[PDB]
Short mmCIF file of C-alpha atoms and ligand atoms in Angstrom, two decimals:
data_model
loop_
_atom_site.label_atom_id
_atom_site.label_comp_id
_atom_site.label_asym_id
_atom_site.label_seq_id
_atom_site.Cartn_x
_atom_site.Cartn_y
_atom_site.Cartn_z
CA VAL A 1 -41.11 -31.43 66.44
CA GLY A 2 -41.35 -27.91 64.99
CA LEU A 3 -40.17 -25.92 61.97
CA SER A 4 -37.02 -27.11 60.22
CA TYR A 5 -34.12 -24.70 59.76
CA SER A 6 -35.11 -24.01 56.15
CA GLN A 7 -38.75 -23.39 57.07
CA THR A 8 -37.60 -20.92 59.71
CA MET A 9 -35.46 -19.19 57.10
CA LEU A 10 -38.51 -18.97 54.86
CA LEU A 11 -40.77 -17.66 57.63
CA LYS A 12 -38.18 -14.99 58.45
CA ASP A 13 -38.37 -13.66 54.90
CA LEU A 14 -42.17 -13.78 54.63
CA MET A 15 -42.49 -11.86 57.90
CA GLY A 16 -40.70 -9.01 56.14
CA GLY A 17 -44.04 -8.36 54.46
CA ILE A 18 -45.37 -7.17 57.83
CA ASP A 19 -45.31 -3.45 58.58
CA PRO A 20 -43.94 -3.13 62.14
CA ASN A 21 -45.85 0.13 62.71
CA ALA A 22 -49.11 -0.53 60.88
CA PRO A 23 -52.28 -1.09 62.91
CA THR A 24 -52.55 -4.88 63.24
CA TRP A 25 -55.37 -7.11 64.44
CA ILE A 26 -54.73 -10.40 66.19
CA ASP A 27 -57.28 -13.04 67.14
CA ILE A 28 -57.15 -16.70 68.14
CA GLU A 29 -59.54 -19.61 68.44
CA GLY A 30 -58.97 -22.09 71.25
CA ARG A 31 -57.63 -21.18 74.67
CA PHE A 32 -54.45 -19.11 75.02
CA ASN A 33 -52.46 -22.12 76.23
CA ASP A 34 -53.83 -24.41 73.51
CA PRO A 35 -54.68 -22.38 70.39
CA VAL A 36 -56.12 -24.02 67.25
CA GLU A 37 -56.38 -21.07 64.87
CA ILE A 38 -54.27 -17.90 64.78
CA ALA A 39 -54.89 -14.81 62.68
CA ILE A 40 -52.87 -11.61 62.41
CA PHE A 41 -54.36 -9.01 60.06
CA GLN A 42 -53.06 -5.69 58.73
CA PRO A 43 -55.98 -3.80 57.12
CA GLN A 44 -53.85 -1.01 55.60
CA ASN A 45 -52.08 -3.36 53.17
CA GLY A 46 -54.40 -6.36 53.40
CA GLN A 47 -51.55 -8.65 54.43
CA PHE A 48 -52.31 -11.24 57.11
CA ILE A 49 -50.93 -14.32 58.85
CA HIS A 50 -53.42 -17.18 59.09
CA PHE A 51 -52.57 -20.70 60.23
CA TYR A 52 -53.69 -23.58 62.44
CA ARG A 53 -52.57 -25.87 65.26
CA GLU A 54 -53.44 -29.33 66.55
CA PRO A 55 -55.02 -29.04 70.03
CA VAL A 56 -53.48 -30.96 72.94
CA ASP A 57 -56.72 -31.23 74.89
CA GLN A 58 -59.24 -32.74 72.48
CA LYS A 59 -62.09 -32.76 75.00
CA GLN A 60 -61.92 -28.99 75.39
CA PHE A 61 -61.59 -28.63 71.61
CA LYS A 62 -64.92 -30.35 70.95
CA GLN A 63 -66.61 -28.11 73.52
CA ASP A 64 -65.08 -25.03 71.91
CA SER A 65 -66.13 -26.46 68.54
CA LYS A 66 -69.74 -26.91 69.63
CA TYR A 67 -69.82 -23.50 71.34
CA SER A 68 -67.48 -21.30 69.27
CA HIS A 69 -65.39 -22.14 66.19
CA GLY A 70 -67.03 -25.34 64.91
CA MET A 71 -63.72 -26.71 63.65
CA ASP A 72 -63.02 -30.33 62.78
CA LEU A 73 -60.20 -32.20 64.51
CA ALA A 74 -59.43 -34.01 61.25
CA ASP A 75 -58.36 -30.83 59.46
CA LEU A 76 -55.89 -29.84 62.18
CA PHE A 77 -53.71 -32.97 62.30
CA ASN A 78 -52.01 -31.96 59.06
CA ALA A 79 -51.08 -28.59 60.59
CA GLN A 80 -47.38 -27.69 60.76
CA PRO A 81 -46.23 -28.13 64.38
CA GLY A 82 -44.43 -25.31 66.19
CA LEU A 83 -45.67 -22.70 63.72
CA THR A 84 -47.41 -20.70 66.47
CA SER A 85 -44.21 -20.14 68.47
CA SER A 86 -42.17 -19.32 65.38
CA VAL A 87 -44.60 -16.71 64.05
CA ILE A 88 -44.94 -15.00 67.43
CA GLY A 89 -41.18 -15.28 67.80
CA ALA A 90 -40.78 -13.70 64.37
CA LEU A 91 -43.03 -10.71 65.06
CA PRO A 92 -41.28 -7.30 64.94
CA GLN A 93 -40.07 -5.91 68.27
CA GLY A 94 -42.38 -3.69 70.31
CA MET A 95 -45.24 -4.25 67.86
CA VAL A 96 -48.67 -2.95 68.86
CA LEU A 97 -51.45 -5.44 68.13
CA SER A 98 -55.15 -4.66 68.35
CA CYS A 99 -57.47 -7.40 69.61
CA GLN A 100 -60.66 -8.38 71.42
CA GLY A 101 -60.33 -9.99 74.84
CA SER A 102 -56.76 -8.89 75.45
CA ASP A 103 -56.57 -11.11 78.53
CA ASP A 104 -55.91 -14.31 76.58
CA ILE A 105 -53.76 -12.68 73.89
CA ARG A 106 -51.63 -11.23 76.68
CA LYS A 107 -51.07 -14.70 78.12
CA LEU A 108 -50.29 -16.18 74.70
CA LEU A 109 -47.69 -13.52 73.93
CA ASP A 110 -46.28 -13.70 77.47
CA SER A 111 -45.86 -17.47 77.18
CA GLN A 112 -43.70 -16.68 74.15
CA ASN A 113 -41.70 -14.09 76.11
CA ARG A 114 -43.04 -11.24 73.98
CA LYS A 115 -43.84 -8.82 76.80
CA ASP A 116 -42.61 -6.10 74.43
CA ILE A 117 -45.67 -6.45 72.21
CA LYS A 118 -48.30 -4.02 73.51
CA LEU A 119 -52.03 -4.64 73.12
CA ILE A 120 -54.88 -2.32 72.19
CA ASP A 121 -58.06 -3.93 73.49
CA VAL A 122 -61.11 -3.01 71.41
CA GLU A 123 -64.48 -4.44 72.46
CA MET A 124 -67.36 -4.73 70.01
CA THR A 125 -70.99 -4.03 70.84
CA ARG A 126 -73.16 -7.02 69.96
CA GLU A 127 -75.07 -4.97 67.37
CA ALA A 128 -71.88 -3.61 65.80
CA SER A 129 -70.56 -7.10 65.10
CA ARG A 130 -74.08 -8.36 64.33
CA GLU A 131 -74.17 -5.94 61.40
CA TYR A 132 -70.81 -6.74 59.81
CA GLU A 133 -70.53 -10.45 60.69
CA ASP A 134 -72.66 -11.64 57.76
CA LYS A 135 -71.08 -9.16 55.35
CA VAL A 136 -67.49 -10.21 56.13
CA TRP A 137 -68.23 -13.94 55.79
CA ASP A 138 -69.78 -13.35 52.36
CA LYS A 139 -66.86 -11.37 50.95
CA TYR A 140 -63.95 -13.02 52.78
CA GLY A 141 -65.39 -16.41 53.78
CA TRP A 142 -63.42 -18.13 51.02
CA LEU A 143 -60.24 -17.49 53.01
CA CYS A 144 -61.11 -20.05 55.69
CA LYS A 145 -63.24 -23.16 55.16
CA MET A 146 -62.26 -24.89 58.39
CA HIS A 147 -65.41 -24.04 60.34
CA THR A 148 -67.69 -26.72 58.91
CA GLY A 149 -69.22 -28.10 62.10
CA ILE A 150 -72.39 -26.38 63.30
CA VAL A 151 -72.06 -24.11 66.34
CA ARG A 152 -74.74 -23.45 68.96
CA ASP A 153 -75.60 -20.45 71.10
CA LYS A 154 -77.26 -20.84 74.50
CA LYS A 155 -80.75 -22.37 74.22
CA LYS A 156 -79.51 -24.49 71.29
CA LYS A 157 -79.76 -21.59 68.83
CA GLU A 158 -77.53 -22.01 65.76
CA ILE A 159 -75.20 -19.09 65.07
CA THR A 160 -72.33 -18.26 62.71
CA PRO A 161 -69.02 -19.90 63.72
CA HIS A 162 -66.09 -17.81 64.96
CA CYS A 163 -63.02 -17.64 62.71
CA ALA A 164 -59.75 -16.11 63.89
CA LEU A 165 -59.34 -14.47 60.48
CA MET A 166 -62.95 -13.35 60.03
CA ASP A 167 -62.94 -12.00 63.58
CA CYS A 168 -60.05 -9.69 62.68
CA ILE A 169 -61.84 -8.34 59.61
CA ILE A 170 -65.13 -7.98 61.50
CA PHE A 171 -63.33 -6.19 64.34
CA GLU A 172 -61.70 -3.88 61.81
CA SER A 173 -65.10 -3.11 60.31
CA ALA A 174 -66.99 -2.47 63.53
CA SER A 175 -64.27 -0.36 65.18
CA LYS A 176 -63.74 1.64 61.98
CA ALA A 177 -67.54 1.46 61.62
CA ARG A 178 -67.26 0.48 57.94
CA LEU A 179 -66.60 -2.72 55.99
CA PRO A 180 -62.97 -2.39 54.84
CA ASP A 181 -62.55 -2.99 51.11
CA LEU A 182 -59.00 -3.95 50.16
CA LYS A 183 -58.63 -5.00 46.52
CA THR A 184 -55.91 -7.51 47.43
CA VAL A 185 -55.95 -9.59 50.61
CA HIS A 186 -53.55 -12.51 51.03
CA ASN A 187 -51.87 -14.87 53.48
CA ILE A 188 -48.10 -14.41 53.67
CA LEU A 189 -47.79 -18.04 54.80
CA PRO A 190 -47.71 -20.62 51.97
CA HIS A 191 -49.71 -23.84 52.05
CA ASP A 192 -46.39 -25.70 52.31
CA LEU A 193 -45.59 -23.94 55.59
CA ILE A 194 -49.08 -23.97 57.11
CA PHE A 195 -49.35 -27.75 56.73
CA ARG A 196 -47.05 -30.71 57.40
CA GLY A 197 -44.57 -31.75 54.75
CA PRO A 198 -43.10 -35.26 54.60
CA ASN A 199 -41.74 -36.61 57.90
CA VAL A 200 -38.00 -35.92 58.16
CA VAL A 201 -35.25 -37.22 60.43
CA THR A 202 -34.47 -34.75 63.22
CA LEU A 203 -31.25 -34.96 65.21
CA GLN B 1 -37.19 -29.87 74.67
CA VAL B 2 -38.39 -30.14 71.06
CA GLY B 3 -35.68 -28.18 69.27
CA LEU B 4 -34.24 -24.74 68.57
CA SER B 5 -36.49 -21.76 69.28
CA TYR B 6 -36.99 -19.09 66.63
CA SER B 7 -34.50 -16.63 68.15
CA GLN B 8 -31.88 -19.38 68.43
CA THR B 9 -32.27 -20.21 64.74
CA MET B 10 -31.86 -16.52 63.92
CA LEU B 11 -28.62 -16.52 65.89
CA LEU B 12 -27.33 -19.70 64.27
CA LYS B 13 -27.89 -18.14 60.85
CA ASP B 14 -25.69 -15.15 61.68
CA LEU B 15 -22.96 -17.23 63.31
CA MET B 16 -22.75 -19.48 60.25
CA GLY B 17 -21.37 -16.45 58.43
CA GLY B 18 -18.08 -17.28 60.11
CA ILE B 19 -17.85 -20.44 58.01
CA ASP B 20 -16.05 -20.00 54.69
CA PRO B 21 -18.10 -21.95 52.11
CA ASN B 22 -15.09 -22.32 49.81
CA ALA B 23 -12.43 -23.13 52.42
CA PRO B 24 -11.13 -26.68 52.98
CA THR B 25 -13.22 -28.12 55.83
CA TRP B 26 -13.01 -31.25 57.97
CA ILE B 27 -16.02 -33.04 59.41
CA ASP B 28 -16.03 -35.87 61.95
CA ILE B 29 -18.52 -37.37 64.40
CA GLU B 30 -18.80 -39.72 67.37
CA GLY B 31 -21.70 -42.14 67.59
CA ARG B 32 -23.38 -43.54 64.49
CA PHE B 33 -24.90 -41.50 61.66
CA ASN B 34 -28.38 -42.32 62.96
CA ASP B 35 -27.52 -41.45 66.56
CA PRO B 36 -24.55 -39.03 66.75
CA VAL B 37 -23.34 -37.59 70.07
CA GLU B 38 -20.48 -35.32 68.99
CA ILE B 39 -20.13 -33.27 65.81
CA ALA B 40 -17.06 -31.33 64.68
CA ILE B 41 -16.75 -29.19 61.57
CA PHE B 42 -13.28 -27.65 61.31
CA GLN B 43 -11.65 -25.07 59.01
CA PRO B 44 -7.85 -25.24 59.46
CA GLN B 45 -6.86 -22.14 57.48
CA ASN B 46 -8.54 -19.75 59.93
CA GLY B 47 -9.18 -22.02 62.91
CA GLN B 48 -12.93 -21.45 62.61
CA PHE B 49 -14.91 -24.52 63.64
CA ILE B 50 -18.28 -25.87 64.77
CA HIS B 51 -18.28 -28.08 67.86
CA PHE B 52 -21.36 -29.30 69.71
CA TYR B 53 -22.94 -32.34 71.34
CA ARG B 54 -26.11 -34.44 71.31
CA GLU B 55 -27.91 -36.91 73.57
CA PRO B 56 -28.14 -40.47 72.19
CA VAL B 57 -31.42 -42.34 71.73
CA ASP B 58 -29.69 -45.69 72.21
CA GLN B 59 -27.95 -45.43 75.59
CA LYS B 60 -26.83 -49.06 75.47
CA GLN B 61 -24.85 -48.72 72.24
CA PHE B 62 -23.52 -45.38 73.48
CA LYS B 63 -21.91 -47.18 76.42
CA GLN B 64 -20.25 -49.60 74.01
CA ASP B 65 -18.91 -46.60 72.12
CA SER B 66 -17.82 -45.01 75.39
CA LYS B 67 -15.91 -48.20 76.19
CA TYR B 68 -14.29 -48.66 72.80
CA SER B 69 -13.89 -45.22 71.18
CA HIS B 70 -15.01 -41.80 72.43
CA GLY B 71 -15.43 -42.37 76.18
CA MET B 72 -18.09 -39.71 76.73
CA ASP B 73 -20.22 -39.27 79.84
CA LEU B 74 -23.98 -39.54 79.29
CA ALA B 75 -24.49 -37.04 82.12
CA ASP B 76 -22.64 -34.33 80.20
CA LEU B 77 -24.90 -34.79 77.17
CA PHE B 78 -28.24 -34.34 78.96
CA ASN B 79 -27.88 -30.56 78.94
CA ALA B 80 -27.23 -30.49 75.18
CA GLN B 81 -29.51 -28.33 73.02
CA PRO B 82 -31.92 -30.65 71.18
CA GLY B 83 -32.39 -30.40 67.42
CA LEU B 84 -29.05 -28.62 67.09
CA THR B 85 -27.55 -31.30 64.84
CA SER B 86 -30.34 -30.86 62.29
CA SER B 87 -30.16 -27.06 62.56
CA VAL B 88 -26.39 -26.75 62.05
CA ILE B 89 -26.49 -29.13 59.08
CA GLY B 90 -29.44 -27.29 57.58
CA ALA B 91 -27.53 -24.04 58.09
CA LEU B 92 -24.38 -25.21 56.29
CA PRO B 93 -23.60 -23.26 53.08
CA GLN B 94 -24.94 -24.80 49.87
CA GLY B 95 -22.79 -27.27 47.94
CA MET B 96 -20.00 -27.08 50.51
CA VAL B 97 -17.11 -29.54 50.10
CA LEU B 98 -16.17 -31.46 53.26
CA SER B 99 -13.35 -33.88 54.04
CA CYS B 100 -13.49 -36.81 56.46
CA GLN B 101 -11.99 -40.13 57.57
CA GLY B 102 -14.68 -42.63 56.59
CA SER B 103 -17.33 -40.83 54.57
CA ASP B 104 -19.73 -43.75 55.05
CA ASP B 105 -21.64 -42.56 58.13
CA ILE B 106 -21.15 -38.90 57.17
CA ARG B 107 -22.93 -39.50 53.85
CA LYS B 108 -25.91 -41.11 55.55
CA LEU B 109 -25.95 -38.35 58.16
CA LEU B 110 -25.99 -35.57 55.57
CA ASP B 111 -28.35 -37.57 53.35
CA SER B 112 -30.79 -37.95 56.23
CA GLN B 113 -30.91 -34.14 56.22
CA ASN B 114 -31.53 -33.88 52.46
CA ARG B 115 -28.10 -32.23 52.10
CA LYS B 116 -26.90 -34.22 49.10
CA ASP B 117 -25.49 -30.96 47.73
CA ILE B 118 -22.72 -31.11 50.33
CA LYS B 119 -19.83 -33.13 48.85
CA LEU B 120 -17.67 -35.53 50.86
CA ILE B 121 -13.99 -36.18 50.19
CA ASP B 122 -13.13 -39.57 51.69
CA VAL B 123 -9.62 -38.84 52.95
CA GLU B 124 -8.75 -42.51 53.39
CA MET B 125 -5.59 -43.05 55.43
CA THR B 126 -3.51 -45.77 57.11
CA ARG B 127 -5.13 -45.39 60.53
CA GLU B 128 -1.50 -45.56 61.67
CA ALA B 129 0.03 -42.63 59.81
CA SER B 130 -3.43 -41.10 60.25
CA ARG B 131 -2.82 -41.27 64.01
CA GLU B 132 0.90 -40.50 64.38
CA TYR B 133 -0.09 -36.92 65.20
CA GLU B 134 -2.70 -38.13 67.71
CA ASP B 135 -0.44 -37.63 70.73
CA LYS B 136 0.86 -34.33 69.35
CA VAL B 137 -2.62 -32.90 68.75
CA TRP B 138 -4.07 -33.77 72.16
CA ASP B 139 -0.89 -32.18 73.51
CA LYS B 140 -1.25 -28.78 71.86
CA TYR B 141 -5.02 -28.61 71.41
CA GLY B 142 -6.37 -30.99 74.06
CA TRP B 143 -8.03 -28.09 75.86
CA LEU B 144 -10.56 -27.74 73.03
CA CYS B 145 -12.65 -30.66 74.32
CA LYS B 146 -12.72 -32.21 77.79
CA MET B 147 -15.84 -34.31 77.24
CA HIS B 148 -13.83 -37.54 77.02
CA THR B 149 -13.30 -38.46 80.66
CA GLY B 150 -13.96 -42.19 80.41
CA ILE B 151 -11.26 -44.83 79.99
CA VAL B 152 -11.18 -46.28 76.48
CA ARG B 153 -9.70 -49.71 75.70
CA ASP B 154 -9.24 -51.98 72.68
CA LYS B 155 -10.69 -55.49 72.40
CA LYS B 156 -7.59 -56.63 74.30
CA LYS B 157 -8.49 -54.39 77.25
CA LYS B 158 -5.39 -52.25 76.59
CA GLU B 159 -6.02 -48.54 77.17
CA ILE B 160 -6.11 -46.19 74.18
CA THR B 161 -6.55 -42.43 73.79
CA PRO B 162 -10.25 -41.53 73.42
CA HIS B 163 -11.65 -40.50 70.03
CA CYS B 164 -12.86 -36.89 69.74
CA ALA B 165 -14.74 -35.46 66.75
CA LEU B 166 -13.00 -32.10 67.08
CA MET B 167 -9.59 -33.55 67.88
CA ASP B 168 -9.98 -36.03 65.02
CA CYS B 169 -10.53 -33.15 62.61
CA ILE B 170 -7.21 -31.69 63.75
CA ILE B 171 -5.45 -35.07 63.70
CA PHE B 172 -6.57 -35.82 60.14
CA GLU B 173 -5.63 -32.28 59.12
CA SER B 174 -2.15 -32.92 60.53
CA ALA B 175 -1.73 -36.20 58.66
CA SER B 176 -3.06 -34.65 55.45
CA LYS B 177 -0.30 -32.01 55.52
CA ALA B 178 2.47 -34.07 57.15
CA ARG B 179 2.66 -31.54 59.99
CA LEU B 180 0.75 -30.43 63.08
CA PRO B 181 -1.24 -27.23 62.35
CA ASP B 182 0.05 -24.10 64.10
CA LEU B 183 -3.39 -22.62 64.75
CA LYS B 184 -2.79 -19.09 66.03
CA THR B 185 -6.51 -18.47 66.48
CA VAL B 186 -9.33 -20.91 67.17
CA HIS B 187 -13.05 -20.17 67.29
CA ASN B 188 -16.12 -22.29 68.00
CA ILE B 189 -18.77 -20.26 66.18
CA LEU B 190 -21.44 -21.80 68.40
CA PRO B 191 -21.70 -20.01 71.76
CA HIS B 192 -22.62 -21.79 74.98
CA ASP B 193 -26.11 -20.36 74.40
CA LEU B 194 -26.70 -22.67 71.44
CA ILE B 195 -24.60 -25.69 72.44
CA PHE B 196 -26.68 -26.29 75.58
CA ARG B 197 -30.41 -26.03 76.27
CA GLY B 198 -31.68 -22.84 77.87
CA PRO B 199 -34.54 -22.45 80.38
CA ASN B 200 -37.73 -24.32 79.45
CA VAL B 201 -40.18 -22.50 77.17
CA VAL B 202 -43.79 -23.06 76.15
CA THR B 203 -43.77 -24.13 72.49
CA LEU B 204 -46.99 -24.09 70.47
K1 K C 1 -15.12 -25.71 72.43
MG1 MG C 2 -14.34 -39.93 64.77
ZN1 ZN C 3 -61.03 -19.78 60.28
ZN1 ZN C 4 -14.49 -34.11 71.97
#
């Protein structure tokens, strides 16, 4: 099951709040073929798209949880199915998205037949992200409270979890070399659309 | 596989513009409200209509229907676009007034889609006078649906003309006006792109 007709109508309208030409960050958690958290962020206006997805492969999700995003499988079951394909399907034509690790984002977009969406790959030096990582989580951490489980670096060293949304803001900071301060930052997607509503008959 | 893609839904929205919300409109179906296999929404004044198909969950009961009413081939329904029934109904104009022969199943069908706003006019009829135009309709407008290949018989094993959702809309329209419609133009707003499933796509 995916988005109902009405939910798709809603999404269509909300996506109008996206500037087709504005510089836009995109980041995902989970593999390209089985994402669990998607973030699309426009720093110029502070508008972003942040939502979740239930992973097919749960074994790989726990590994990625222990090694990367530290997300709980319990929080993702209530996620609205099909949302990932609808959002990417709803993106403006020929949009240029900035990202880190374009390889997987390219596959994700290609799987959705969005070969029109070009990608600017922007890689962050460890020290550049090291500097802004803490600062972004403090200011904007209230936006995502899904990364509760502890994450571990090599040698069993605890580190800060990776959030699709925080990643975007951190990437924006480090590439622009300054913490971006936008008075208003908000998710265009309502809670009603990010998470499952009541089960409905589909014919 | 799952249902309509985003682009499809965007297309359906535009094509539904062809439907006049305030025009008299017929609706009929084949299969039960909980497991329909043919849907027809018909506007006689302009010949604009919505005609599409669906694959049944219950194949066994579908064969009983194929024997006794609509005579549709299960092979022809495999290639039908899934989720289309829910999409078309969700795309119908608000508070639209529909007419039908036996509003029972239609109510439950529309109710199961939270479309209680849509009103149903139960055009009850003789089922004899309501079918005097049956032969005449299939004659003039039989080319509108060739999904009914199977032989249909009554409980007495005597052959009868198959029941078609689209053709029924036209038959009931005939009986409701005491004359066969002279539809100069006809138009199924749904293209073949939406009626049938396209190439498989990764859906996340
Ligand atoms: K047709
Ligand atoms: Mg009928
Ligand atoms: Zn997050
Ligand atoms: Zn038919």
